[PDB]
Design a protein around this ligand. Structure first.
Ligand SMILES: *[C@@H]1O[C@H](CO)[C@@H](O[C@@H]2O[C@H](CO)[C@@H](O)[C@H](O)[C@H]2NC(C)=O)[C@H](O)[C@H]1NC(C)=O
Ligand SMILES: *[C@@H]1O[C@H](CO)[C@@H](O[C@@H]2O[C@H](CO)[C@@H](O)[C@H](O)[C@H]2NC(C)=O)[C@H](O)[C@H]1NC(C)=O
Ligand SMILES: *[C@@H]1O[C@H](CO)[C@@H](O)[C@H](O)[C@H]1NC(C)=O
Ligand SMILES: *[C@@H]1O[C@H](CO)[C@@H](O)[C@H](O)[C@H]1NC(C)=O
Ligand SMILES: *[C@@H]1O[C@H](CO)[C@@H](O)[C@H](O)[C@H]1NC(C)=O
Lengths: 454, 447, 440
C-alpha cells in the first residue's frame, strides 16, 4: 500500500519531495480587441502600395479563420445544428457553444468599428456604452509612433516605405506560424494567451495587464485565448481570454522519487520505475508531469494528467522490489548518491565514501546495493569533495543488515525493445510447437489406450 | 479493404475527415544574395574596432561552410563529356563517404555554380549596397536581389540618432546590434550546420541570416502558405564571400502533388464502456490508404488542413497485421487502455449522428423529455434523429441527423479487444514480466 | 576492428564517418552582473507609476530565486566546506554540488556586492567596474540601450503618455520574454545546468556580448557546455550575479563514435530497412549505444556536455559483430528511405529498387532477387549512372566477391508506438492461450 519507501530506497529510488496536485478550473471570461494593421494616417505621405499589398496578404491568412468560425455561427440556430456541422469533436462543439456565447458581446464591441479604425496609440481604452470598457491593442503602432514619426526627417520617402514594408513583413513572418494554414481549427480554446499575443508581437504581458497568483497560471499554459470575431475591412480580431483559477485536488499528492545508481552482482544498475507517482485517494497511478509546472510545493496542470499503471509496477512501488525492473548503467553521469530526511543514500562501491569525524573510510560490501549513512555511524561524511553532516534515520535500526531482492534486468532502448520483442516472439513460437507435440504424442498415444482397452 | 467504420465506432473510433494526400515535387529554383555585414559607410565616425571584431568573428562561423562547399566543387570534375546539359560527374574517391541525399545536393550545387559565378561579378556593387533590399542587374536583364542584415536598423535608427547621441554610445548601440544578430543567427549557421551541402534547410531557417524576415525574402522573389507551412520551401547555400561578407542562396520553391488513390482518414477517439470502467482504444488516429494498402503515417511532421495532409516527403510507415486486422473488422485485435483522466473525450459527432458514452456522461432527449440511458452491456450509444431530434448533452444542445448505417446499431454487440498499458515504464515491466513468465513456462515444456 | 563492417553493409548499414568523442571537463569560472531595471533617470520626467509597477512585478519573479538560494547559504556552515544535511533534508547530489559551488561563489559575490550604489547608477548597456583589486567586474543592464538610443532621442517629439507607453511596452515585452526561463519554472536555481544562452534571456538573449565581455568557443556553445549559475539576487537594486562556467573539452581515450549509413535492401520480393543503431560508441574494447541527439555532431567529433553512453543488448551487440541474423529488419513503405550510399568511394546500392547503369560500359547493372544489395566498385563500372546522378568509383577494399556470398537476414519487426502494444498483447494472449495447454 501507499508506497514502500525504505524497500524502494535500497533498489535506488529515494523519497524526493511530496507535492500538492493542482488543476485549473472555474474559468473567467474577458474580451479584447487586437488590431493587426497600424495607424499610418499620421505618416501617410510616403507609404506607397505597401498597404494595398499587406492588406490583401493579411486577408489571405485571416479570411479562412472567419470562414471556419462562421460555419459554427450560421449553423448554431443554445442549439447546434448537427446535420450542418456534420463531423466534429466534443471539444470543438463546446468551443462552438462558447463562441455563440461570445457573439452577444462581440456584436456590441463591433459597434465601435469606426473608432477602432482610427485608434492613435498602441493600447487604447474604449467605452462600450455601458460604462463597460473594451481595450484595443494595435500592432506596430508603438514602432510607428516612436521610431518612424520622429525619424521621418532624417529618413526619406522611398526609405521610410522600406522601413515600413520591412516591419510589416517581419511582423507577418512572426505571426504566420500560429495564425497560418496551421491553425486549422480556430473554433477552440486551447490556444495559449502567449501564442495568441503573437498577433500583438508576443507581448502577452501588456495584453494580460490591461485586463488586470498569475505566473503559476501563465507557466502551466492555463491562460488561454479564443478568437471570437474577425473583421476583414478594419483588420482586427476579438479575443475572449479565459483566465481560470487553480484548485487543489483532494487527498491527491505527487511523490517524487530520486534515482540513485546501485550495486548488484559486480555492476551498477538503475531502477526502471516512474520518478513521479500520483496518489489520489487510496489509488496510485502514473502522471505525465512533463506537461505540467513542477514547483517547490505543487505540480500545476492545465488538465488531469493521470495515466494507468500496470499491477506489477504498482506492486513494485508497494513492496515487491523483485518486480521493479532494473537496467545496466554505462554512463559516468547517472547519479551515485542522494539525500533524504538528512540521511544519505550512497553507492559507496561506485563512489568512495569516508567519515571526516571518525577518520575511517565508509566501505560497502559487494552483497549490498546501497548504503544508508546517518548520524549513528558518521556525523560528518566526506563524499569525494563534498562534506556533509547527517541526521538520524527514522527507519529500520539495521537497514544495512537486511537484504532487498533485486528485480529483473531489462533494456530500455527503442532499438533494443524491437530486438527483445522479436527474440521473444521467436522463443514463444519456437516453444509453441513443443506444445503442439502433445496434440499427437499425448492424444493419439492415449486414444491408442482406448483400442488397447477395447 | 475499406476500414470497418461501424465496427470501429463501437470500440470508440468514429469516422473523422477523409483527406487528400499531398507531397512536394518539381522545385522551381530561384537565387538570392544575403549580405551579412551592414553598410556603415554613412556612419564610420564612431565604430571602434567593433567591425574589425565582428568581421573576424563572422569569418569564424562562415569559413567552414565555404570550405565544406568547395570540397564538392573541386570534386565534381564534371560536365561529363565536356557539355553543359550532358550531365555532371562527382568524384567518388575524392568524396569517399557520403549519402545519396548529400551527393544530390552536390549535383544541385554544381548546377548552381554557373549562375553563382555570374552573380559574383557584381561583387564591388554588392559591397557598397546602401539599403536593406536592393535590386541589381546581372547584365542579362536577369535581375538579382541583395538583402543586407541590420542595414535598415542602421539607416533608420543610428543615422537618425547620431546628432543626439555621443560616440561610445553610437558604437555601443552598433556592437550590441551586431552581437544580438550574431547570437540569433548562431543556432542555424553555427558548428551546428555541419553538412551545408544539403537542401533541407527551410527558408524560414535560412532567413535567420536576414533576421527571420522570410516574408520579404520570399516576396522579392515571388498555395504559397501551404508550401511554407509544410517546410517545403528550402534554401541551399551555394557560395560564401569572405571579404565582402555575403552569401548566395538557391531557393527551392516546389509545387505539391496529390498522391493518387491515396487518402488520410482521421479517426476521432471517444472513451467507451466495458465491464464497469472507461476504456480508450489504442489504434492510430490517422491511417493512410493508398491503392488497396492501409498503412501508418506520421502526420506530426506534415501540415493538416480541412481538405488535405501536406507533407514535404512521403511519411508512410508499416503497420502490423494485427493493427491492420483490427481496422478492417477484428475489434478483438484492437488493444484498449484504461481511462483515468477526466479529459479524454466522452462523445463525438459524425455524419450528424452522435456517438456518446452515456454511462460516463448523462445524455437526454430535449424533444421527448426522457433521459437517454445506456446499458452496462454496451460500449457506446449511437444516437440519431430516429430517437432524438434534439439532444441535451450536459450543457450543449445539438440537433441530429439520420444515421446511414445499421438500423439497430445498439442491439448488436461488438467484441472488445485485449487491455494494454501504453506507458514507457510499463512497457519494460510488461516485457520483463513476459520474459519471466515464458522462461518459467519454458521449463514445464522441458518436463 | 570491433564491428563487422562488410557483413553489416549487406544488411544495409554502410560505414559512415568515425568520430572523436569529447565531453566537457575542467570548468573555468568567471562572474558577471545582470541589472534588470534600466537607468531611466535621463527621462525620469513622465514615466508615471510604471516603474513602481515594473519593480513589484519583477520582485515577484525574482524573490523566490533569492529565497531558494539563501536556503543553501543559511545551511552551509563551514570553511570545514560542510553542508547541513538535516537542514537541507532532501536533495540530489547534483544540487548539493551546485550548493558547494554557490558557497564557493559567495566569497567574490560579497566583494562584488560592495559596488552596489555604483551598479545602481550605471549609465550604459555594458559597463566595466573596478572591484578594488584591479580585478574588474562587468555590468550588463537590460533595455538600457533601447532607452539611450530610442527613447532619449525620441523624447522631444512624443507626448507624456506616449513616452510612458513605449516604456511600459518595452518593460512588459522584456518581462514576457524573460518569464519562461526565470519564472516559477526555474524551481531549482541552486544548479549549474542553465545554459549561458538561456541565462542571457535576462540580457535579452544577447549571450554574444555577455561572453565577449568576459573573453573553440562555438563548439562549446553549441553543446550547451557553457552554463550559468545564479549566485546572488539584489531586490532593492534589481540585479543578479551569475557565475559563468566556461569549460574545456577533453577527448575520451580509445573511444570513437561510428556512424552507420542506412540503405534500403532487398529480400524476398520487398524492401527492408535494418533496425540497428546508426551511431555506435566504441570505447576500449566495449561497444555500446550513445544518445547523439543531445550532443553536437561535427565533421571530426561528437561533442557532449556529459557522457551519454547507454547499454546495448547482447543480441544487438552480436548483430554488429557478425550475426546479421540477429539484426532486426522492418518493411519499407516510404518512397523516401534512401536507396544507395557511398563509402570508401565504392557504391552500395539497391539496384532492384532503383535502376543502376554503367555509363562507361553502356550495359545496365542489374541485381538478382537473391541478393540484398549491390556493391559496385570500379572493377565492374568506372562510372555509374544512378537515375540522374553520374558518379565515378574506386576499388573496394573488401571481399573480392561481395556479391556472390549471401548474408542471412534477421527477423522482421514493427517499430511503431501503437504496434508495439499490439505486438506485446498479442504475445501475451498467445502465451496465456498456450499456458493452458501446459496445464493440460
Ligand atoms: C454565413 O453567414 C455569413 C454572415 O453571418 C456570411 O457572410 C456574408 O458574406 C457575404 C460575402 O459574399 C456578404 O455580402 C454579407 O455581408 C455576409 N452576410 C451578412 C449577413 O452580413 C457567409 O457567407 C456565410 N457562410 C459561411 C460558410 O460561413
Ligand atoms: C433526420 O436527418 C435527416 C438527414 O440529416 C433529415 O433528412 C433531410 O431533411 C431535410 C429537410 O427536410 C432535407 O432537405 C434533406 O433532403 C433530407 N435528407 C435525407 C437524406 O433524407 C431528416 O429530416 C431528419 N429527421 C428529422 C425528424 O428531423
Ligand atoms: C542525530 O540527530 C539529531 C541531531 O540533533 C539528534 O536528535 C540525535 O540525538 C542524533 N543522534 C546521535 C547519536 O548523534
Ligand atoms: C536565513 O537566516 C536569516 C536570519 O538571520 C534570515 O534573515 C533569512 O530570511 C533566512 N532565510 C532562509 C531561507 O531561511
Ligand atoms: C580504380 O581506381 C584507382 C585509380 O587510381 C586504381 O587504384 C584502380 O586500379 C582502379 N581500377 C579500375 C578497374 O578502374
Amino acid at each position: 500500500g501507499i508506497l514502500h519507501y525504505e524497500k524502494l530506497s535500497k533498489i535506488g529510488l529515494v523519497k524526493g519531495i511530496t507535492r500538492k496536485y493542482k488543476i485549473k478550473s472555474n474559468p473567467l471570461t474577458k474580451d479584447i480587441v487586437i488590431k493587426m494593421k497600424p495607424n499610418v494616417s499620421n505618416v501617410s505621405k510616403c507609404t506607397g502600395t505597401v498597404m494595398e499589398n499587406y492588406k490583401s496578404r493579411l486577408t489571405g491568412i485571416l479570411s479562412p479563420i472567419k470562414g471556419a468560425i462562421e460555419l459554427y455561427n450560421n449553423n448554431t440556430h443554445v442549439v447546434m445544428a448537427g446535420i450542418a456541422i456534420g463531423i466534429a469533436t466534443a471539444a470543438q462543439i463546446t468551443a462552438g457553444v462558447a463562441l455563440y456565447e461570445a457573439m452577444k458581446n462581440a456584436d456590441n464591441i463591433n459597434k465601435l468599428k469606426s473608432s477602432i479604425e482610427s485608434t492613435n496609440e498602441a493600447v487604447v481604452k474604449l467605452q462600450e456604452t455601458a460604462e463597460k470598457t473594451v481595450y484595443v491593442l494595435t500592432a506596430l503602432q508603438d514602432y510607428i509612433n516612436t521610431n518612424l514619426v520622429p525619424s521621418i526627417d532624417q529618413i526619406s520617402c522611398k526609405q521610410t516605405e522600406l522601413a515600413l514594408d520591412l516591419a510589416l513583413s517581419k511582423y507577418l513572418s512572426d505571426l504566420l506560424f500560429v495564425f497560418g494554414p496551421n491553425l486549422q481549427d480556430p473554433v477552440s480554446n486551447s490556444m495559449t494567451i502567449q501564442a495568441i499575443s503573437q498577433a500583438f508581437g508576443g507581448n502577452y504581458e501588456t495584453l494580460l495587464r490591461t485586463l488586470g497568483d498569475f505566473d503559476d497560471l501563465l507557466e502551466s499554459d492555463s491562460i488561454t485565448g479564443q478568437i471570437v470575431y474577425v473583421d476583414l475591412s478594419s483588420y482586427y480580431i476579438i479575443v475572449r481570454v479565459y483566465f481560470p483559477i487553480l484548485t487543489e485536488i483532494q487527498q491527491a499528492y505527487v511523490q517524487e522519487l530520486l534515482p540513485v545508481s546501485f550495486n548488484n552482482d559486480n555492476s551498477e544498475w538503475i531502477s526502471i520505475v516512474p520518478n513521479f507517482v500520483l496518489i489520489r485517494n487510496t489509488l496510485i497511478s502514473n502522471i505525465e508531469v512533463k506537461y505540467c509546472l513542477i514547483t517547490k510545493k505543487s505540480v500545476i496542470c492545465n488538465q488531469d494528467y493521470a495515466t494507468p499503471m500496470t499491477a506489477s509496477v504498482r506492486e513494485c512501488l508497494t513492496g515487491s522490489t523483485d518486480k521493479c525492473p532494473r537496467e545496466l548503467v554505462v554512463s559516468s553521469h547517472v547519479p551515485r548518491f542522494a539525500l533524504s530526511g538528512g540521511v544519505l543514500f550512497a553507492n559507496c562501491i561506485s563512489v568512495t565514501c569516508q567519515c571526516q569525524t571518525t577518520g575511517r573510510a565508509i566501505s560497502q560490501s559487494g552483497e549490498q546495493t546501497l548504503l544508508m549513512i546517518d548520524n549513528t555511524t558518521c556525523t560528518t561524511v566526506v563524499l569525494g569533495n563534498i562534506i556533509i553532516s547527517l541526521g538520524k534515520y527514522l527507519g529500520s535500526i539495521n537497514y544495512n543488515s537486511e537484504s532487498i531482492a533485486v528485480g529483473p534486468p531489462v533494456y530500455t532502448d527503442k532499438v533494443d525493445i524491437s530486438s527483445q520483442i522479436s527474440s521473444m516472439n521467436q522463443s514463444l513460437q519456437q516453444s509453441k510447437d513443443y506444445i503442439k507435440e502433445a496434440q499427437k504424442i499425448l492424444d493419439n498415444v492415449e486414444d491408442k489406450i482406448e483400442e488397447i482397452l477395447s
